[PDB]
Amino acid sequence: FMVSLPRMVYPQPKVLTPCRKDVLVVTPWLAPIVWEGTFNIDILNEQFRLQNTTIGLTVFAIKKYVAFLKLFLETAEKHFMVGHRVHYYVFTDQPAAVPRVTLGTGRQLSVLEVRRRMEMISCERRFLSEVDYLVCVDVDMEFRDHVGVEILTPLFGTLHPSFYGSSREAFTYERRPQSQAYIPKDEGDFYYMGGFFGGSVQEVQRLTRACHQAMMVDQANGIEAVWHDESHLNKYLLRHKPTKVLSPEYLWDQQLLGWPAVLRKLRFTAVP
Amino acid sequence: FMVSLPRMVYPQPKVLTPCRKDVLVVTPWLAPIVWEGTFNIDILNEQFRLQNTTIGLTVFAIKKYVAFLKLFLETAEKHFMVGHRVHYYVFTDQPAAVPRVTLGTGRQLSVLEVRRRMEMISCERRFLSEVDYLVCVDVDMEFRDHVGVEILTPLFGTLHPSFYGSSREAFTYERRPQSQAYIPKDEGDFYYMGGFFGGSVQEVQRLTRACHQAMMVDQANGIEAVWHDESHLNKYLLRHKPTKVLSPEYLWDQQLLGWPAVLRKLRFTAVP
Numbered sequence: 001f002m003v004s005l006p007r008m009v010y011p012q013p014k015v016l017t018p019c020r021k022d023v024l025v026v027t028p029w030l031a032p033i034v035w036e037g038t039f040n041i042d043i044l045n046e047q048f049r050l051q052n053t054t055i056g057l058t059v060f061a062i063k064k065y066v067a068f069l070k071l072f073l074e075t076a077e078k079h080f081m082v083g084h085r086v087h088y089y090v091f092t093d094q095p096a097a098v099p100r101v102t103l104g105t106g107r108q109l110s111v112l113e114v115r116r117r118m119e120m121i122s123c124e125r126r127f128l129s130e131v132d133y134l135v136c137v138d139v140d141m142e143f144r145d146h147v148g149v150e151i152l153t154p155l156f157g158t159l160h161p162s163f164y165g166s167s168r169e170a171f172t173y174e175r176r177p178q179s180q181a182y183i184p185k186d187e188g189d190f191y192y193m194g195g196f197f198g199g200s201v202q203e204v205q206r207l208t209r210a211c212h213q214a215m216m217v218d219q220a221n222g223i224e225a226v227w228h229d230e231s232h233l234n235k236y237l238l239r240h241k242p243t244k245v246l247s248p249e250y251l252w253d254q255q256l257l258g259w260p261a262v263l264r265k266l267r268f269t270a271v272p
Numbered sequence: 273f274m275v276s277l278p279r280m281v282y283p284q285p286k287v288l289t290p291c292r293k294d295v296l297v298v299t300p301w302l303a304p305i306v307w308e309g310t311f312n313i314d315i316l317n318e319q320f321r322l323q324n325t326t327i328g329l330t331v332f333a334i335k336k337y338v339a340f341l342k343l344f345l346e347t348a349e350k351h352f353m354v355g356h357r358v359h360y361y362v363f364t365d366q367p368a369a370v371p372r373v374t375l376g377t378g379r380q381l382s383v384l385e386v387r388r389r390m391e392m393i394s395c396e397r398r399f400l401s402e403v404d405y406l407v408c409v410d411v412d413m414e415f416r417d418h419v420g421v422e423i424l425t426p427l428f429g430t431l432h433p434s435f436y437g438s439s440r441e442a443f444t445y446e447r448r449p450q451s452q453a454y455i456p457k458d459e460g461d462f463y464y465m466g467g468f469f470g471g472s473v474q475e476v477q478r479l480t481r482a483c484h485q486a487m488m489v490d491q492a493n494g495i496e497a498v499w500h501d502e503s504h505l506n507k508y509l510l511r512h513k514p515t516k517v518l519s520p521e522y523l524w525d526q527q528l529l530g531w532p533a534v535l536r537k538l539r540f541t542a543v544p
């Protein structure tokens with residue numbers, strides 16, 4: 001049950017003025033494509049706080065990648081879901097190497113030791129009891145700007161920053177029919193980045209279970225998809241359309257790609 | 273649980289080409305605004321048939337308005353949810369005046385005698401057992417073009433065709449603070465038409481229950497909102513944002529308003 005929003009004063013949306021004319025803001029299956037200028041975050045914040053939303057954030061830091069956790073977490077504290085309840089889940093082979101990062105109120109961090117990601121995510125019972133949404137990201141990254149509840153939806157993927165202007169034939173999908181991840185040249189909506197996906201816990205467990213099962217099939221058949229879990233995530237999202245798509249604001253590499261005008265904000269970026 | 277879509281061949285959506293540049297296609301709370309050119313109906317049809325979706329359509333035909341049922345139903349057979357399971361619910365004081373209209377397969381009609389609409393809709397148990405979505409419309413109308421599963425979502429309203437280009441101060445909301453339906457001059461997103469709303473059964477029962485309760489408050493206080501249930505529906509939708517908004521394609525009056533270029537299709541229209 002959703003209680004009423006309080007009174008709010010904000011600019012009237014005008015039907016005959018689009019927010020953004022330069023980019024596609026809704027997919028052909030009627031999922032929003034999340035760009036700056038498309039959302040009023042005050043409205044969204046109210047909606048999600050009235051539900052007392054808890055967001056879980058999963059990150060894997062194995063071997064040398066523990067070095068990235070400090071900046072990842074510190075910047076997440078500045079920019080990720082601020083004002084909301086957050087549970088970080090840090091999966092690592094080196095629990096003692098996790099940096100001690102000071103968290104804002106209503107935010108917690110759990111260190112989970114591990115001895116791959118799709119298997120490990122599909123923790124099932126724990127997540128269902130502890131968070132409403134799961135966000136699953138790469139660690140070798142930093143938050144530079146707002147990443148908030150505008151992303152939350154039952155199932156989301158993120159446009160890969162090297163391919164958002166590309167034609168589908170250029171996408172680096174798995175092209176061998178012998179792989180579970182195969183996508184023919186005349187199929188595909190988008191090329192999604194494996195380093196930023198999420199959803200409700202139920203939908204994320206469905207995705208990760210399906211990808212893990214497909215990866216095990218491929219292993220048994222002696223085939224490894226071209227881009228590993230990202231190829232399988234692409235297959236899944238072709239066949240199970242996401243209910244929002246995040247623009248490349250949400251997964252960028254400034255060194256490789258610069259700061260194009262169509263990106264008003266660079267929110268989550270690769271570390272050099 | 274949602275099974276995988278089959279393989280499909282269709283045009284690639286391109287991120288750097290918008291469908292429509294002339295109109296707002298997503299609200300600031302990230303709900304799609306449904307216009308022609310925003311959706312691939314083949315994708316949507318597949319999604320909703322894989323769930324074996326049933327749509328209920330409610331219409332009231334009291335007193336002289338029974339004369340409108342023939343054209344309403346016949347045109348609904350040509351254009352409303354064709355291919356999907358449909359249950360029409362015709363609420364009337366004259367069961368014997370309901371015309372005998374030939375229905376396509378998978379479509380049924382129930383005549384419900386009545387001795388107002390919000391009360392009557394909030395049939396609760398019946399609808400929960402028999403349909404997935406409810407669509408609630410005026411009878412003095414005809415389908416001229418496709419109205420399909422692109423409208424379906426937990427909660428939708430429709431832009432009133434006299435006000436989609438208007439500023440909020442011009443909207444004919446209830447402006448007396450003594451009414452439950454009151455909306456100040458500096459609030460409002462849109463002016464929704466009371467003759468076309470819908471949603472999941474749960475959400476429609478929430479809306480109609482809330483509006484009926486608010487109307488009873490007003491009655492007890494000796495006040496009748498300016499536009500009756502439509503004023504209350506407006507209040508509700510301001511405080512409970514719809515998860516899709518239908519463009520005025522979906523509720524038009526060609527005699528009063530013509531055929532403007534921004535309307536590519538005239539789907540559901542007033543009868544002269």
Ligand SMILES: O=c1ccn([C@@H]2O[C@H](COP(=O)(O)OP(=O)(O)O)[C@@H](O)[C@H]2O)c(=O)[nH]1
Nearest residue numbers: 059060061062063064065137138139140195
């Ligand atoms: O030795 C490794 C390799 C990978 N990863 C985790 O797997 C993610 C995906 O790998 P990586 O970021 O290297 O892929 P890339 O972005 O270089 O193609 C990493 O961000 C970490 O989050 C890790 O923890 N340790």
Ligand SMILES: O=c1ccn([C@@H]2O[C@H](COP(=O)(O)OP(=O)(O)O)[C@@H](O)[C@H]2O)c(=O)[nH]1
Nearest residue numbers: 331332333334335336337409410411412467
């Ligand atoms: O005598 C009446 C008056 C109203 N209605 C039902 O109430 C709807 C709303 O009234 P109406 O369509 O007259 O409102 P309008 O569009 O003229 O402002 C009608 O479409 C019917 O669907 C009816 O059945 N009989």
Ligand SMILES: OC[C@H]1O[C@@H](O)[C@H](O)[C@@H](O)[C@H]1O
Nearest residue numbers: 160162171172193194227230
């Ligand atoms: O072609 C797909 C690849 O594109 C690269 O830019 C990225 O570093 C890889 O992880 C993979 O996503």
Ligand SMILES: OC[C@H]1O[C@@H](O)[C@H](O)[C@@H](O)[C@H]1O
Nearest residue numbers: 432434443444465466499502
């Ligand atoms: O101002 C609101 C009104 O606008 C009219 O055009 C319509 O006939 C009425 O039913 C009501 O919606």
